[PDB]
């Protein structure tokens, strides 16, 4: 239900304790009032109580409302937006805009109808309105909230209550943040085992990535902390079960997804790959057992241990890594490679979703990595009658052995891929916004211990890696937790 | 109200309040108890912090109890006692002594406020509510002179200028504006008097004295904005509510006397002598309650001074000691009270007949030498009271004792008067008026024109509704 002891420690502090934060912090408008949820709220509360900024705020709200409205209501909403904010005599008309910006808004028509208008509003709001905000109690309230965000919230704050899964380095428990009662998944990594098997680099890249990236198609890191025996990641709980499980379990006699389900999962995965690729990350571990369903039937990618962050200027990488059967020819051959490898994995995943087997080996056949390698390099993929002509087409485009001919990430987006006929019946606008009804709404045993790890002592280098790994609370998710969970509502009161 | 002016009522950016932060009286009593916005913000803050919830609600309930009606008080005592003093009750005040709970209401309040002045206040200072307070104290200190008031009709005439009824343009609250002509003030040397009136009306806060809100200057006048009193003066009422049967009837006279006393008391407790109590100076409001006014001849007694000298006041109301040349204290005001009550009942002074023209020299001689006689209109209790007050020797005169008029309130005249309900403005009055009836110069004017007085302004901001409007967090 949630713990008295810990709730009582979520309390906005006195102002004098926020003097430190005041300076050593990001004053950035985009960072404070656009990307950080509490930051956003407080900024909008500020604009709401200053009458002059009413017309900007409402346009802002009304644009965000329009971006996620249903296709039915849109034309109507698009008109009411133009009628309220873009006619020189309307009550909430927006002086601060160019003629050229107001003109384009009135005349636009398409996928990103009001994104130039939103950019203009945000640019305006980022000027004086923001400067006034900084000079106001609402900004100070933000600091109180940031102060709280930075208070220690380590192992004591989470209650493991059941086993969700098992990794190479530890179990993954369902757990509750005792203060707010929110449910998370807590992936535990045994410190001695990590050392002995030399999995530190892998552990760090997963945390670095889950930390920095915010996408509804990638599991999100909330907290990182350490216990005496383990490193712990607290992340988005996914109770649905991995895709692979559902491919073989939905029908034992007739395994595989009906195509609309496989296209929905494919679209969601793609959108996850695109968020990674836009941030110069190569996943390198896409495959059915790493795609998780949540309580509603929505998927996200997971297991980022094999991912590589490309540096500034770097467009390619090298390194043998991945699961046999999903690694692209480039990778197998030892060549330099980019994001293409992930699209090759995508195709093998789509394949398996449809056909209940890999493109390169029959169901329940043992094939050794050496042989499975030559298959991937030399074998033409055959497609059984199970596949529609659209799904054959798409896989063929992803299974292209030559990366340069492979479909995928061009011009900083996946928009090319999205127009492929397979997605004919998908509102990408809505998929990305999290609105579409998923196709199948869903509805573990504890093994005990991992074997003893004899003869492993820690050096300072090990301890530093652990303190570095245990970097604490991630702002955006914590702030999200505070809001969804009611704690923001309670503590942000002025006079109840 | 006015858009242009209401528009100027806006809370400032926090950076503009760093001036006030370090140059204001941080005292607890002044900030959170006396000042209405500081009080609201303190309470708002406390309500926010649950640990302090018990203390807040107790304070509130003691004040609600103190202003309830006699019929309800017993049940509010029991509920307060059971709700805050039983050890098992949820809202139990841990902080209080065992010695004070056994004793338990005024003492209790002093204990609760004592506690709220320690940690709770210190936490408040380190909170957003104090900064909001500083915001409101910036707006308070902003310039609000001649331009903000629009005078709309004359209410009366004095010796140094007219007294208009005007309205504050931004809040639409009506006041009275006593305007003094600068040139006239110098030529008649009224400087000291206008100054004394202003400093006194600024510093005292009682429902029975007119309250200064603002104080400013035009090119031609020095202007005092104060509590509007549309009921007219008491003299006017003695001789025009009925010209055939002038005078008041006793319970009415007893009513106003009680109010005058309380006002007199308030001045005396703060070492002030009114020195000019008389019916033409007691004014009525629209509800029918009175307030003393025209404090120009008031003297402020310093620390460690029990008496003063100085011939000042209105002939026939100045007491023997003062006329004689002796030293005197608050007792002179009680002598003027006696005269005042007498005139309220008998439609004539005790030292002259109605319409009898007598001059200062002889009027003096009478005040010193004449035995006051009482017609039948005076009941035995009225008689005894006036006799007490008009006793020519100040030693034998009923007056201010042991820092209070508690002694004088005991007199049989006020047997029908519930004191807390009067002193708390609750009692219905006995008559409700009908709505239908050189360089050293320029430095003095600047120094006179001090500006806005906090308490009444804060009060104005709440009653008028501006506080509710501009103190919002998420509407
Ligand atoms: N967010 C989550 N919600 C629910 N279950 C999860 C979550 N993340 C991982 N799991 C489960 O936890 C276990 C570990 O998965 P994960 O892929 O993170 O481990 P891993 O040790 O990195 O695997 P590998 O060694 O193959 O890289 C699996 O049973 C997986 O299904
Ligand atoms: N608050 C008020 N509300 C309404 N009328 C008032 C108020 N104050 C003064 N007046 C009017 O102005 C008249 C004279 O006021 P007041 O006695 O203060 O002037 P003054 O010049 O100080 O008088 P004096 O000449 O005795 O010093 C009063 O009789 C009354 O009619
Ligand atoms: Cl503010
Ligand atoms: Cl299906
Ligand atoms: Mg891993
Ligand atoms: Mg007068």
XYZ file of N, CA and C in Angstrom, chain A residues 11 13-17 42 45 48-50 135-138 140-141 144 492-496, chain B residues 11-16 41 44 47-48 50 126-129 131-132 135 471-475:
138
model
N 9.586 15.246 1.962
C 9.110 16.551 2.420
C 9.953 17.672 1.851
N 12.061 20.773 1.486
C 12.958 21.293 2.494
C 12.879 22.806 2.592
N 13.421 23.379 3.675
C 13.583 24.818 3.793
C 14.411 25.388 2.663
N 14.242 26.676 2.402
C 14.877 27.321 1.248
C 16.400 27.387 1.342
N 16.912 27.623 2.541
C 18.341 27.755 2.776
C 19.142 26.512 2.419
N 18.488 25.356 2.385
C 19.137 24.116 1.992
C 19.235 23.949 0.483
N 5.537 23.407 -13.111
C 5.709 24.629 -12.359
C 5.786 25.807 -13.311
N 2.225 26.474 -14.315
C 1.539 27.146 -13.202
C 1.918 28.630 -13.154
N 0.207 30.396 -15.991
C -1.236 30.379 -15.789
C -1.668 31.498 -14.853
N -0.836 31.834 -13.871
C -1.169 32.911 -12.942
C -0.638 34.285 -13.355
N 0.000 34.383 -14.518
C 0.370 35.691 -15.072
C -0.391 35.910 -16.378
N 12.612 34.459 -11.627
C 12.537 35.466 -10.579
C 11.267 35.348 -9.713
N 10.803 34.114 -9.502
C 9.480 33.863 -8.939
C 9.500 32.654 -8.025
N 8.491 32.553 -7.167
C 8.456 31.505 -6.151
C 8.329 30.125 -6.797
N 7.729 30.079 -7.989
C 7.541 28.811 -8.700
C 8.875 28.192 -9.071
N 11.568 28.759 -7.336
C 12.087 28.289 -6.062
C 11.455 26.957 -5.692
N 10.164 26.791 -5.952
C 9.531 25.503 -5.667
C 10.199 24.384 -6.464
N 13.164 23.297 -4.497
C 12.797 22.437 -3.398
C 12.611 21.041 -3.920
N 2.967 19.820 -3.389
C 2.975 21.092 -4.109
C 1.779 21.994 -3.783
N 1.125 21.707 -2.675
C -0.002 22.488 -2.242
C 0.485 23.843 -1.724
N -0.337 24.872 -1.938
C -0.129 26.187 -1.355
C -1.087 26.355 -0.185
N -2.378 26.162 -0.439
C -3.378 26.190 0.632
C -4.480 25.152 0.394
N -4.382 23.973 1.047
C -5.424 22.949 0.883
C -6.584 23.149 1.876
N 1.945 41.579 -7.714
C 3.081 41.124 -6.921
C 4.373 41.198 -7.744
N 5.464 41.679 -7.130
C 6.695 41.913 -7.857
C 7.530 40.665 -8.056
N 8.493 40.733 -8.979
C 9.538 39.726 -9.028
C 10.300 39.671 -7.713
N 10.750 38.482 -7.342
C 11.409 38.270 -6.054
C 12.686 39.095 -5.883
N 13.375 39.397 -6.981
C 14.623 40.160 -6.912
C 14.423 41.594 -6.392
N 13.228 42.151 -6.611
C 12.892 43.502 -6.153
C 12.630 43.585 -4.647
N -0.559 34.310 5.924
C 0.525 33.545 5.333
C 1.135 32.580 6.324
N -1.543 29.844 6.590
C -1.445 29.066 5.362
C -0.242 28.125 5.426
N -0.867 25.294 8.246
C -1.790 24.314 7.670
C -1.065 23.350 6.719
N -0.132 23.880 5.938
C 0.694 23.076 5.029
C 1.524 22.009 5.762
N 1.954 19.464 8.638
C 0.993 18.716 9.465
C 1.414 18.620 10.936
N 12.043 30.490 6.630
C 12.847 29.742 5.667
C 11.962 29.070 4.603
N 10.850 29.717 4.256
C 9.849 29.120 3.383
C 9.316 30.102 2.365
N 8.586 29.570 1.386
C 8.045 30.385 0.306
C 7.011 31.399 0.785
N 6.426 31.148 1.952
C 5.338 31.973 2.452
C 5.870 33.298 2.961
N 8.603 34.722 1.705
C 8.904 35.447 0.477
C 7.630 36.033 -0.120
N 6.529 35.304 -0.059
C 5.270 35.872 -0.509
C 4.940 37.079 0.346
N 6.809 39.916 -0.769
C 6.198 40.415 -1.996
C 5.085 41.416 -1.676
N -3.068 36.272 -4.459
C -2.330 35.272 -3.671
C -2.531 33.835 -4.181
N -3.053 33.701 -5.400
C -3.378 32.387 -5.954
C -2.146 31.662 -6.469
N -2.215 30.334 -6.406
C -1.113 29.434 -6.757
C -1.453 28.611 -8.000
N -2.700 28.141 -8.101
C -3.173 27.390 -9.275
C -4.704 27.441 -9.402
N -5.247 28.433 -10.139
C -6.708 28.602 -10.131
C -7.418 27.772 -11.199
